[PDB]
Structure formats: structure tokens, C-alpha cells
Amino acid sequence: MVILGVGYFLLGLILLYYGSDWFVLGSERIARHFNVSNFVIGATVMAIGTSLPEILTSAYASYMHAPGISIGNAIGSCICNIGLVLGLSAIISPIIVDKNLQKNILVYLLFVIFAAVIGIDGFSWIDGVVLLILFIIYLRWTVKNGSAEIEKNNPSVVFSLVLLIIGLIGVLVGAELFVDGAKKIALALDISDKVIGFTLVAFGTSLPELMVSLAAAKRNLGGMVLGNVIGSNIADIGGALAVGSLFMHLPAENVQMAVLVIMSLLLYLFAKYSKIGRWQGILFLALYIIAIASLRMGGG
């Protein structure tokens, strides 16, 4: 039963590795097909695709009367996407943000500040509906401003969509196998710890973002990286958190929200007045490390 766990674990890593690169390549081609920037494709198709685990997890957790896990997973993913995912990626491929993308990031920041303020007393189903509506508006606004609309079944298109979809299946299945594999290893060795397992929920669901962002960074696709991070956070709030709140009132996470707000503000300030490169990435990593060293365990 331990060899099966090791099997899943290694296999999940393989799928994650190759799948992420396929997803990126297919997404980069699709962007060129539709005449939209890499940021746009990153913030929409990629962000949502990779946030499907958060959405499902938050929904499932709140339905099972564990709303703390529901919001813990959602906001923890956001902190992970900036501190760990963007941190690593910025070091690998530093980014200077153009003026139009700076505007997108400011909208993101406002969205996050708005979510923090209405969530001070926790999140109701009404808070959820509002956030989901802003999420949809964000998506349409983003696509419009990053689109140059001008124009059977071209082999370039097909191969693009195949890469993208198979890549996405690869990263999502791979993330699942990684986690399921780890869990059966821990169970087999009798080192299973539930509160540890619930602490790592936002991470396991963030493995697609991590591997996808790293693959894009290796190909110097900085805008795509930034799109994936910014979009995943909005999807995690207007999607994962929001849907959670539909089943049950979510408890406040004011400390984690303050952390997210601070990291999000830092991200905008770097984008606007500087760059997102080596030392910005180092700072994001240091803050992430401080966060996981100090924040209360249990995943909510």
C-alpha cells in the first residue's frame, strides 16, 4: 500500500512537469490565435483552469460544514500564489509591467481590498454573489482591454487546443495523484496528521499554478505568469471563496486577509514604480516563509 502511494506520487510529478509545459505552450498559441496578450490568456483560461481545485474544494468543504477550511483554502492559495509562485517565478524571469497591465493589477488590488473589508465579519452568501459578479466583470473587462478583435479548422488551432486541454488534464490529474500518493504514503507509514493535512490543502490545490507558472517563467513568459497569479487570486476569491459562502457563512480570516492585502499592495507598487524581478521575488519568498512559519495551522 506504500508502493502504490509512491507510484501515484512519482507519476503525479511527471504529469505535473510535462502537463504544465503543454498547458503553457497550448495557452501561448491560443493567445496568438485569438489575438490576445499572454496576460489575458493567463488571467482567464489558465487562472480558472488551475483554480478548479480551489473552487471544488471550497464548495465541498462548506457543504460538509467545514467553512473554515473553505475560506482557509481560498485565501491561503492567494498568499501562496504571490509569495511562493510569483516569488520563484520573478527570480527565474524578471518582469517589467507595461502601463495597461499596471491598470489591471490596480483593479485586482481594489478587488482584494473590497473583499477584505466586507469579510471583516466573515462572508455571507450575499457577499459571495457580489464577489462572483465582480469576478465576471473583471474577466470581461480584462479580455476586452487585451483583445485586438479583427477576424474552417486549421491544424494550428486544433493542435493548440489539444495541447492546452491535455496539458490541463495532465496538471489537474497530476496534482491529484501527487496529493493522493503523499496521503497513502503517510497513512502507510503511520505518520498521518489531519491538522497538517488540512494546513497543506491550499498548497496541493496550488500545485497547478506553481508548476504552470514555473514552466511559463522558464520560457520567459512574464505576462502569462503575472496573468495566472492575478487571475487565480480573483478566481479564488470571486469563485472559490464565493461559492463556499453560498453553502454556509464563512468565518472571518482578518489576519490572512491583511497579509494578502499587504502582499497585493506590494505587488502593485512593484509593478507600477519598479519591476517584479530578483529582489522583489526574494522579498515575496521571505514573506511567504514568515507566513508559513507564523500563521495558525489547521487550514482554517
Ligand X SMILES: O=c1c(O)c(-c2cc(O)c(O)c(O)c2)oc2cc(O)cc(O)c12
Interacting residues with ligand X (CB under 6 A): 136, 139-140, 143
Contact predicate 19/171, CB 8 Å: yes
**Interaction between residue 121 and Ca ion (CB under 5 A):** yes
What does 253-276 look like in DSSP terms, one character per residue? -HHHHHHHHHHHHHHHHHHHHS-B
- Least Å distance, CB 151 to Ca ion, is 8
Task: Name the one residue in this structure whose C-alpha cell is 470571486.
Answer: 238
The 268-287 site mask, x for binding ligand MYS (CB under 6 A), equals --x---x---xxx-xx-xxx
Q: Give the whole-angstrom CA distance, residue 193 versus residue 213.
A: 29
**3-state helix, strand and coil shares in percent for the chain, rounded to the nearest 5:** 80, 5, 15
Q: Contact letters (x/-) for ligand MYS, 88-127, by CB under 6 A?
A: ---x------------------------------------
Interface residue with Na ion among 27, 62, 206, 245 (CB under 5 A) is 206
Least distance in angstroms from the C-beta of 139 to Ca ion: 23
- Cα–Cα distance, 275 to 244 (Å, whole number): 35
Among residues 290, 298, 299, 300, which is the contact residue for ligand MYS, using CB under 6 A? 290
For residue 121, state whether it binds ligand OLC (rule: CB under 6 A): yes
Of residues 106 and 290, the one with the C-beta less far from ligand MYS: 290
Q: How far apart are CA 93 and CA 133, in angstroms?
A: 33
Q: Is 127 in the site for ligand OLC (CB under 6 A)?
A: yes
Within 8 A by CB and 6+ apart from 183, the residues are: 5, 192, 197
Q: Binding to Na ion by residue 232, rule CB under 5 A?
A: yes
Residue nearest to ligand OLC (CB): 114
Among ligand OLC, ligand MYS, Ca ion, none, the one that 33 touches (CB under a kind-dependent 5 to 8 A) is: Ca ion
DSSP of 3-67: HHHHHHHHHHHHHHHHHHHHHHHHHHHHHHHTTB-HHHHIIIIIHHHHHHHHHHHHHHHHHTT-H
**Residue 253 interacts with ligand OLC (CB under 6 A): yes or no:** no
Interaction site with Na ion (CB under 5 A): 47, 50-51, 53-54, 77, 202, 205-206, 208-209, 232
